[PDB]
Design a protein around this ligand. Structure first.
Ligand SMILES: COCCc1sc(S(=O)(=O)NC(=O)Nc2ncc(Br)s2)cc1C
Ligand SMILES: COCCc1sc(S(=O)(=O)NC(=O)Nc2ncc(Br)s2)cc1C
Ligand SMILES: COCCc1sc(S(=O)(=O)NC(=O)Nc2ncc(Br)s2)cc1C
Ligand SMILES: COCCc1sc(S(=O)(=O)NC(=O)Nc2ncc(Br)s2)cc1C
Lengths: 317, 319, 317, 317
């Protein structure tokens, strides 16, 4: 049987006997993703070049407005906004959404894959909403995922029931369920990180990478891929197995990627798919944030690969 | 004033006072590129998943380019990554051009929605003999036009001719390629290197040393960043837009590289040179290699001239 | 605030505190209508013409399959199917849907506007589902409407809350709320019927049309429009007012249009918009059917114009 | 072999060994038509209704800017413009284009079919370009035709080589040739006119319509169709045969449709398809215009039907 994103979400919502607030949340977000996708693929650019005589701001506005008007949110945290947005009282719902509206857009000049990342938490207080409602560990995530604007557009949605992948059919504007209850391979054959900054590596990362290229047990060398767009590399890791690293070093002891709207959603997708996600010191989902824009190191992917990196990390005390 | 690919090609054709065969050629390729883009973005996939109650993308892509080029009446010999032998166009549809193309490069990893692309190179048939596979064995210096479509976050067609390199963005709402970047030039020197460092144990010593100099510069300057998509069109386009260097070099297991000379290396080498970049195998210019086999491989190092020159200096230190 | 069809229906569903089944049905129909519009506009026609070396059947399959897989239906009546379709037990829901998957498609060779018409009933007995469950008067409709595939694609949805019009945005595949709680004019200036068959007219139809062209007083004669496609003529009647007639005569004493999936849904839309719909003898919505494909005469539109027609009709009785 | 609009025009152009100017014009016109088609279908309407927080004018701007920038035109007459537009000196070419950028858009509130109509002349005088260069009879047309934005978008192009029909495939933005060297039926079975003006009809029109409804020779009466959008009514006349009439009435004693960019292009298409187009007094294409927006009565379509009307017209002197 064919299934769509909206029908899938409604059926899971009905099973859970929920009120519908989360469904309204996701349906609005799905609409914003379709509008982002259309602009990313440059529909209407002929009018910009005068046929009749920005993108990351629009993406933020599309997500902000669709979530606000959904009546399911009260606090919105965005890569694009210095402070958390508080939904106006008459529009308030019970959910907090942290999102990166258009990740990778710094390099969109070369048409690199880009994506939208989102994580959804339930509000913690019964009081007036505040930024504190966004300062939850990832363990409390109710749902998370991302849209990948790659050769085609795909939305990956992770919840308690697992991870499901939906392909956007642009002919009809519907996300089609194409991969159900996906699980990452136990062990992959690809590592992904910016090796150009090797001069700064932590000793453990230097050693772990050394083992991928010159395996001690005669086994085959790993291949290397690094798009430089986090959603594209994390999605490749999910589909093919392997490991993705944006680790801590001396110049960046807490990493570069953002915990609330990059690290935590991807870790949740990974764990629901049977993978792992560590900062080196602890599971990503266990870091308790004190700032909405704080950074975290991240190593994630196939469990045998993350376990192997953690073994090397532990050897270096 | 707005410009489109078709309007661009016609006006250049009129300047040159040609017969129109090349314009008919490029317009047919353009049409195939839009149909490939439409299929790559998965338009209509809901029907494959039973919305009402089936071919492979690289086979469909090859059929699109083949049929549009045959039906243009502008071609006589067609070389495709997908066909062991050259296709010789039937007599009533024959024109004067030879086209080498990779209909969907990078589709090996299309399971992960990696950027993919179409690569093409266009030659004038040179002899009066009957057309045969031999007419495709010209060095890249003989290219009349070349370029690629990149199906990335957006679809873009990059067209290189003697007048320079021009970039056209596909507007999907109207199906037109809009000229968005005119006469593009690559930076003299970049800050990105691009290759599969996972296979370092097999590197040529010159490659090992050069990568060493990028990560640990002797002159203390900032280390280069590293990017490698694993899809040639995406990595080369980033090299063209941001500068730097792309390497797919020879080693002892692969003394002739892995990428194919006729429909991957030569078209990309040609685009790079028309943008003021460089493309070498280490031993010679990519465009000067005289091929003997239409599917033969070639090592390729390309990009910003200063970065490729620095590779050649290290490569020379290793004789 | 922007609104979509799915978001609108969800909000009305939560207001009514229903189970979610009707929302699941309408979301399924909406996906089907987007697929029909895409095919009607000839997406992919290049492949049928050899670039790489049915419409009403496809339309029927899209609606049947999306409704079946919705888990919201038990009996489906279609213009295309001789007998009612009974949904298999594992997919049965509580609604009966009568529909015309592609009305007007006989003349689609000239690219005339075409459309999809639907009507939704609640199954009334606990018996095994059967064709008899579709033989309810239109008064029993829970929801009805039509998709018009015209210069643009529009979904008109009528429920107890009134009539609402949604425009399909093809760039994102969403039905956008553009006209809320629409009402038809009290009196129009257009009449619509096939005047080519005047030799067969009932005397009352002949007299009423003669008065529209030759008014007894000084007022302006009505203009005439007849597309020949029911959804287009009825929709123009909705937007501009006036009267649409496909009446009974001696050769066709029960009319030509079908009651279940053409007359009743349109009659329902008209009455929720403040209009009227009569067979001449009684309201269309009060006819109790005895056959799923039975015909009914229909005269509909602005109430003053239908009342004026009934006055002439009664003069000849 | 598959064929497209651009490839067809290039191939016919090379056959004639022309310079390419007309091809550049028609290619520019095709580009504007696809943009008009996308706008008519409401692409991007979601942004007008706040998803992120004038059609006939846009249509005219698209055609004007695309034709000016083609370097193939020198004088442009548009339904939207009071005076002929004189192309600036550096962009002037040898062609004059009369066009209706969005015909029927008055009633687009009901999503009625609309269309673009065009006629193309070679400039005939050696004077400086002026409004007078647009005043040639339709006999002088080099090319003409129309785009119909109906259930699908279709371009009909008539030249000396005959009439050809191209279907826009919206998935790739290309006009696909689907009907080659089309000919109209010798006699049709549909008549088309606004019968609401019956009180103002000339005796010849009244008699002819009477003959369609009450045939003297026992034959079947014609059916009636009238969309009220000329491109839709004319296109149907071409595809199915029959007759289209817009005669003069009291509001319009010189007729209502405009000679330059409605009557002539359609008359030209009709004659190249083996049909007919008369004012009653003379062939439409032979009328010598004196004013760029002047009106004309028009009767057109299948030749046996237009000849039958002329018989009645001669009977009434
Ligand atoms: C981990 O995710 C838990 C699963 C849940 S729970 C919700 S919900 O709370 O929004 N409830 C509902 O939507 N109920 C409904 N009733 C009728 C309709 Br028609 S939808 C959504 C999802 C995806
Ligand atoms: C390096 O390439 C040189 C540039 C060239 S030369 C040609 S051509 O040979 O095809 N000639 C023509 O197209 N003539 C025409 N006449 C009228 C029209 Br309308 S187009 C195409 C291009 C892009
Ligand atoms: C005659 O009906 C008019 C009003 C109604 S009642 C229904 S319903 O029965 O399907 N109930 C629901 O959809 N409940 C929901 N809960 C959560 C979500 Br989220 S939707 C749909 C409509 C449009
Ligand atoms: C009066 O209609 C006769 C048919 C004609 S003649 C012209 S034209 O004058 O524009 N010439 C050309 O287009 N030449 C070209 N050379 C190369 C390419 Br490729 S096209 C267009 C059409 C449709």
């Amino acid at each position: 049987d064919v299934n769509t994103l909206t029908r899938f979400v409604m059926e899971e919502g009905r099973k859970a006997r929920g009120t519908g607030e989360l469904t309204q949340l996701l349906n609005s977000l799905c609409t914003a993703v379709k509008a982002i996708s259309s602009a990313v693929r440059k529909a209407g650019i002929a009018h910009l070049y005068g046929i009749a005589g920005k993108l990351d701001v629009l993406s933020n506005d599309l997500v902000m407005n669709m979530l606000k008007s959904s009546f399911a949110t009260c606090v919105l945290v965005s890569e694009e906004d210095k402070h958390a947005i508080i939904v106006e009282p008459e529009k308030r719902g019970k959910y907090v959404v942290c999102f990166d509206p258009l990740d990778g857009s710094s390099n969109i000049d070369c048409l690199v894959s880009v994506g939208t990342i989102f994580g959804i938490y339930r509000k913690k207080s019964t009081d007036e909403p505040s930024e504190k409602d966004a300062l939850q560990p990832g363990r409390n995530l109710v749902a998370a995922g991302y849209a990948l604007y790659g050769s085609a557009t795909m939305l990956v949605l992770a919840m308690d029931c697992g991870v499901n992948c939906f392909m956007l059919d642009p002919a009809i504007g519907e996300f089609i369920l194409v991969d159900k209850d996906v699980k990452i391979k136990k062990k992959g054959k690809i590592y992904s990180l910016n090796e150009g900054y090797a001069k700064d590596f932590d000793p453990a990362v230097t050693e772990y990478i050394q083992r991928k290229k010159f395996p001690p047990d005669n086994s085959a060398p790993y291949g290397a891929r690094y798009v430089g767009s986090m959603v594209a590399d994390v999605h490749r890791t999910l589909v093919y197995g392997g490991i993705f690293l944006y680790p801590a070093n001396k110049k960046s002891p807490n990493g570069k990627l953002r915990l609330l709207y990059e690290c935590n959603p991807m870790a949740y997708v990974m764990e629901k798919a049977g993978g792992m996600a560590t900062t080196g010191k602890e599971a990503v989902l266990d870091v308790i944030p004190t700032d909405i824009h704080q950074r975290a190191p991240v190593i994630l992917g196939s469990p045998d690969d993350v376990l192997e990196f953690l073994k090397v990390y532990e050897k270096h005390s």
